[PDB]
Amino acid sequence: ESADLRALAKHLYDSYIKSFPLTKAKARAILTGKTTDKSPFVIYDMNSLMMGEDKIKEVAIRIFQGCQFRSVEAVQEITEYAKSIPGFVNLDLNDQVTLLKYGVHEIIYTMLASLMNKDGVLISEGQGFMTREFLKSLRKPFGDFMEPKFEFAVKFNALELDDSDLAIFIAVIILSGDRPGLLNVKPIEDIQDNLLQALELQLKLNHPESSQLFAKLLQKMTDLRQIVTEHVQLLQVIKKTETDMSLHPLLQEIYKDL
Ligand SMILES: *c1ccc([N+](=O)[O-])cc1C(=O)Nc1ccc(C(N)=O)cc1
Numbered sequence: 001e002s003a004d005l006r007a008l009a010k011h012l013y014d015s016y017i018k019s020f021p022l023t024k025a026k027a028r029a030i031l032t033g034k035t036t037d038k039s040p041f042v043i044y045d046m047n048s049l050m051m052g053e054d055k056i057k058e059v060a061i062r063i064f065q066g067c068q069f070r071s072v073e074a075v076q077e078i079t080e081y082a083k084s085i086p087g088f089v090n091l092d093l094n095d096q097v098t099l100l101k102y103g104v105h106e107i108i109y110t111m112l113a114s115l116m117n118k119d120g121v122l123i124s125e126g127q128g129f130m131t132r133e134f135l136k137s138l139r140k141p142f143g144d145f146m147e148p149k150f151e152f153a154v155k156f157n158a159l160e161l162d163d164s165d166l167a168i169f170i171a172v173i174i175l176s177g178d179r180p181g182l183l184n185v186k187p188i189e190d191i192q193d194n195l196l197q198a199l200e201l202q203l204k205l206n207h208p209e210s211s212q213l214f215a216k217l218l219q220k221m222t223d224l225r226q227i228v229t230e231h232v233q234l235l236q237v238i239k240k241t242e243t244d245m246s247l248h249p250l251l252q253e254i255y256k257d258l
């Protein structure tokens with residue numbers, strides 16, 4: 001019944017709003033100049049960077065650590081959203097951990113796109129805006145850290161998803177079931193099947209003139225999978241380049257053996 005899928009969609013959107021404080025709708029209002037929201041301070045060089053902590057350890061490292069800790073914050077919100085996905089907390093505890101371990105970066109980036117346009121990314125819960133060129137201008141290893149996220153976000157944002165779409169899409173991601181190590185795959189797939197049904201109906205209702213958006217959105221799951229695997233290699237590069245730099249353990253466990 002369509003009715004139960006709508007209720008699932010409504011449930012997930014509600015928990016998404018409750019777990020993610022900077023929605024795509026707010027981020028768009030911030031990025032496009034709307035009077036519901038206030039203007040970000042735009043970091044685009046070192047000096048504007050050094051005025052940012054007024055208004056909102058070398059430069060590239062300082063930024064990379066803020067990105068690092070800003071990532072843990074996202075994992076916490078994602079983990080809290082996950083708990084609301086019906087059936088998730090009833091799964092084998094070890095499979096929960098595995099679903100999160102693998103899903104978290106594909107969801108963090110997917111929701112991260114909401115904060116991006118081709119020019120840069122919202123930072124410090126939308127109060128800041130660090131330009132894409134300033135990030136690309138950073139020293140050798142960190143200079144290329146965020147570029148592939150921007151490239152993805154540009155293509156992803158072209159789908160023009162709203163938060164109510166993303167809430168279901170993100171749940172679909174978490175409940176994959178093709179994740180390595182999963183002890184009991186069938187109840188995960190039963191959940192994902194319901195979510196995908198929910199996602200599909202949601203996209204047809206919310207984007208009726210958007211042909212095959214459902215298919216096109218699932219295909220984007222390929223780009224996410226690429227980003228995450230690409231992202232871990234540059235992590236290993238920096239751990240060996242900067243012996244002195246400390247990756248958060250919560251994040252370390254995410255990359256442990258992929
Ligand atoms: C930055 C630097 C390092 C890592 N990492 O080793 O996992 C991750 C990041 C990163 O993506 N940080 C981030 C993600 C999402 C947001 C957000 N949605 O606001 C902020 C920062």
Ligand SMILES: CCCCCCCCC(=O)O
Pocket residue numbers: 063066067068070115121122123124125130135146
């Ligand atoms: C999106 C919040 C991040 C705060 C500033 C830290 C830099 C992270 C980034 O470049 O995305």
